[PDB]
Ligand SMILES: OC[C@H]1O[C@@](CO)(O[C@H]2O[C@H](CO)[C@@H](O)[C@H](O)[C@H]2O)[C@@H](O)[C@@H]1O
């Protein structure tokens with residue numbers, strides 16, 4: 001048999017708000033993305049995942065939806081959306097949209113009705129509960145600061161919100177709400193959408209009785225919210241009522257779940273989701289409070305990857321990504337973003353990204369080597385997660401504003417949201433007005449127009465890697481094997497399929513290193529290298545590596 005298209009596709013994540021503005025209001029829009037499809041097509045992209053594009057008050061930039069069937073005013077009209085669809089099809093590309101059904105905006109008609117009275121027909125579309133002992137129903141904290149329970153004076157009860165107070169959680173325990181959600185998914189699927197990424201898919205099921213979390217659970221509340229007892233019954237129901245009738249690919253953002261539970265979401269035999277976005281790797285150096293960082297080495301990096309890969313087993317499938325809209329920039333996070341090493345290391349990371357087993361997702365800008373942004377004050381962050389950390393750690397005296405800044409400058413998701421750098425015109429060609437979030441000053445040296453024609457740019461290296469992966473089955477669907485989980489200097493692994501074996505070797509040190517191939521293995525050909533002065537000799541049994549050198553080889 002053949003492997004589904006999604007297992008050998010290369011996806012690109014577009015955060016519309018920061019991709020391309022075409023009417024100078026400072027916010028990216030659909031017309032801007034449509035206008036750039038040739039750029040994505042030329043890069044070699046097969047499919048695009050776009051962040052939320054529905055009507056939203058934007059308290060959380062698309063993730064607080066006020067109407068699942070209208071497009072966000074800032075991005076355009078349904079007509080623009082359809083046009084995007086049509087233009088992607090002409091290029092043989094597929095669109096994956098974001099599905100945010102753990103919560104809705106508090107401006108959605110369902111919630112406006114729900115909060116009116118305890119007897120309103122929409123009361124149970126959400127979670128309403130009496131406070132206890134003079135305060136909230138229980139000790140549940142919110143991802144974005146303070147309590148997860150908000151009191152509504154209209155009825156005297158509190159409603160639940162794992163996220164923003166303007167993002168009340170939807171009540172999956174209510175059949176009528178589930179059916180409405182299924183009918184809303186068909187509305188988009190009927191328009192031809194090829195894939196759906198499920199926002200915080202592991203938190204749909206709530207714990208009966210809402211008992212207080214234990215002190216330990218409070219330490220990692222994100223994990224506790226992924227343990228609802230009806231989760232998989234609900235995901236299986238959604239697959240049977242909806243996905244069974246279409247040929248869309250499903251990808252779940254399993255945030256907060258213990259890795260050992262991931263197979264329940266992706267084992268194809270369970271008929272739940274097709275693939276998984278996990279966070280063990282991207283948060284491998286993040287502390288439990290989600291804002292401090294902890295020092296890690298390449299040994300920790302590869303070991304996490306091996307664990308995640310082993311979790312897909314035979315019937316499951318993983319996505320692979322080094323960056324997205326909720327995390328710091330890939331080259332700053334995992335590579336070395338100092339001027340003299342940024343390009344070499346961004347190419348190294350590209351080699352890792354495109355040779356991993358699973359479906360890779362390239363986050364907008366990483367193909368250029370975009371970096372974290374030089375925040376100077378807390379006022380430079382738009383992110384509500386940061387305002388939340390201020391409320392929970394500074395106002396409470398657990399940390400000073402300076403300590404918060406020092407740390408969130410390295411972890412804030414806003415590092416990934418500064419406008420895409422198209423060229424060196426005003427605001428790097430992202431807008432003719434004022435960008436909603438400041439463009440990085442390094443756009444003068446890091447921009448698409450400058451890299452596109454240069455054979456040695458980070459962009460060209462990504463383009464070349466994508467081509468190589470597309471022509472080498474082993475690099476998408478082949479087996480994966482880490483050659484030395486304990487080595488903290490050089491990442492080396494093999495990918496194999498149908499008797500064909502490839503070797504990937506990436507130096508993660510800003511110093512020369514050597515690599516001896518497994519005994520019995522010899523280089524056969526060199527497919528590509530970055531930052532290398534000369535390819536190895538056919539038959540080489542070892543490799544000399546320059547600082548941050550990466551290479552893909554066919555062995556024998
Ligand atoms: O970004 C912060 C925070 O939210 C997570 C889910 O736990 O991600 C998804 O849902 C959020 C709320 O809907 C969005 O703000 C975010 O953009 C979306 O990916 C995690 O990434 C993280 O804990």
Ligand SMILES: [Ca+2]
Pocket residue numbers: 021022023024025026027028029074
């Ligand atoms: Ca615009």
